[PDB]
Design a protein around this ligand. Structure first.
Ligand code: K36
Ligand code: K36
Lengths: 306, 306
């Protein structure tokens, strides 16, 4: 028993991280087969960051201007192209450590592990969620761009995120591996607004099920509710409206615990309206929303990877 | 910016995990050079767990009774011995993936990454602290024993923990890699008492410095205090007494932030006496104590590993 914010094992991704330097700017790239993916802002100078014309900037760049380093070994760049906000640097050597992989664009509420890197070397690994305002709450310093977010299913790495920037609120924004930003964000140094940060209701519910499984049950109350009645309380607390799909997704945890989804909704309503009265649930003094139903089953049933 | 419970990258340790089976019991072993380390309870049956005589049980065991599997490949066991609560299974093949490593016995308040494994395969990675009562707050199911806790300094893996058991309180106990338990715990299925769980004061202070660095400053107040005056308030809230060594350890964060350690103590005193009034510090609604001063500098300055 016990419940922790658990990241995927990072080894398969560690073997894909390289360093990409263009002039004075150094960041991280992802080396899959004979291609290195990195943020296109690698080509920017301190001047260029306010309002870069990425097309004009890139024209002044040839293959030999991209220094690509795997450990202490230099890769030879034989091609380069821009896809949305990422560069694809074609190298003459296939990564011998390429795992089975997919590029996936994930949905708000879904979670992933981040391998934070500097100069193509791993610093650390942590779990994040794509929030409803298409931000993540990460830990990123200068040089961290090109750090990736991923899931593992068995032996397959699903890359969903590449790090590009930090907003005024101290939260983080980036792209899928096709270089399309999550949310309305653009890769230029201008004040950009994350909108309302709504709580991922289905994920809070998942986590209350995790708590019940681990013997933390104080908050189970005597009431039930309806989707429409629960959602009136959700709107007030900036919670995502609960839908029958969410109820269906919680079906296995509901069936495992014998606690009906709408009875757990009723418990959640009283926690939102009454607070926690100085108590904790799974060692937490607020309602956690960065565990999916899948994450809870995965953690509470010991699912493993290659 | 931003601050997360960050684990070390796990790849170097992933390549050391094997599966160890003795009769019907399967758990994880650590394969370093030509030696596999695992919990000695691998030799127990369901009967044996209440009051095992480990010496008598082991006598009925030969090399060929220990099935050691690295992925889908069988290792040949050419020797076996008990060291305290671990078995060392000598194999005829040196692990080709052995990293540079040390066995360290860590001190309460120190933190480490756990690679939770089942059947010798990684499930996930998370950060833990050795608590003052020599327990950890992990996530462990049946089959997780032999999972290890570690730190990385550059290219060297320092193994500090091997998982053996869960107490009534839902917290976790285990050994160093010499097989000596942290705390008074023994490897038998009997109600065992973790004592008072004191908060790691120096670690709370470290985390308040992390908060100030990341722009969360609401809790900085107008007061200072003395070690003796602070510690009177610590004892009441079951906080570890603060010492000049702790003050010295916080010296770099104090010097970086220009907030004197005893002024931060005064801020901590008011948080303990007044609570947080429904506010958060670095997204947390309680005082976090599983970040060391080193962890804070490491995270806030981007220290990387091989
Ligand atoms: C990529 O290495 C870098 C990551 C930033 C640096 C601080 N925290 C992060 O997440 N990205 C940028 O510097 C980005 C570049 C533009 C061309 C998009 N600009 C940015 O994020 O501006 C905010 C900022 C910069 C430096 C320190 C703190 C915030
Ligand atoms: C090692 O695989 C296993 C880990 C336990 C299982 C549940 N959570 C854990 O951390 N250790 C044991 O089963 C241990 C064996 C003795 C010979 C020391 N006994 C134990 O931890 O008893 C408590 C327990 C067992 C099963 C489920 C929940 C609690």
């Amino acid at each position: 028993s016990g419940f922790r914010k658990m990241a995927f094992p990072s080894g398969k991704v560690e073997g894909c991280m390289v360093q990409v330097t263009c002039g004075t700017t150094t960041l991280n790239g992802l080396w899959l087969d004979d291609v290195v993916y990195c943020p296109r802002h690698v080509i920017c100078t301190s001047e260029d960051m306010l309002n870069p014309n990425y097309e004009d900037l890139l024209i002044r760049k040839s293959n030999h201007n991209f220094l690509v380093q795997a450990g202490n070994v230099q890769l030879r760049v034989i091609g380069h192209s821009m896809q949305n906000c990422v560069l694809k640097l074609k190298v003459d050597t296939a990564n011998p450590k390429t795992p089975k992989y997919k590029f996936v664009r994930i949905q708000p509420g879904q979670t992933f592990s981040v391998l934070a890197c500097y100069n193509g070397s791993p610093s650390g690994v942590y779990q994040c969620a794509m929030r409803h305002n298409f931000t993540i709450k990460g830990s990123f310093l200068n040089g961290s761009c090109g750090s990736v977010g991923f899931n593992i299913d068995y032996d397959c790495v699903s890359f969903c995120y590449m790090h590009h920037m930090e907003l005024p609120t101290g939260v983080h924004a980036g792209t899928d591996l096709e270089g399309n930003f999550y949310g309305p964000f653009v890769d230029r140094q201008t004040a950009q607004a994350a909108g309302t940060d709504t709580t991922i209701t289905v994920n809070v519910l998942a986590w209350l099920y995790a708590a019940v499984i681990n013997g933390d049950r104080w908050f189970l109350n005597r009431f039930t509710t309806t989707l429409n009645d629960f959602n009136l309380v959700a709107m007030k607390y900036n919670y995502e409206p609960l839908t029958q799909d969410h109820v269906d997704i919680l079906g296995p945890l509901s069936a495992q615990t014998g606690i009906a989804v709408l009875d757990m909704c009723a418990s959640l309503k009283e926690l939102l309206q009454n607070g926690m009265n100085g108590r904790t649930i799974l060692g937490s003094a607020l309602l956690e929303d960065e565990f999916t139903p899948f994450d809870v089953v995965r953690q509470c049933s010991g699912v493993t990877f290659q």
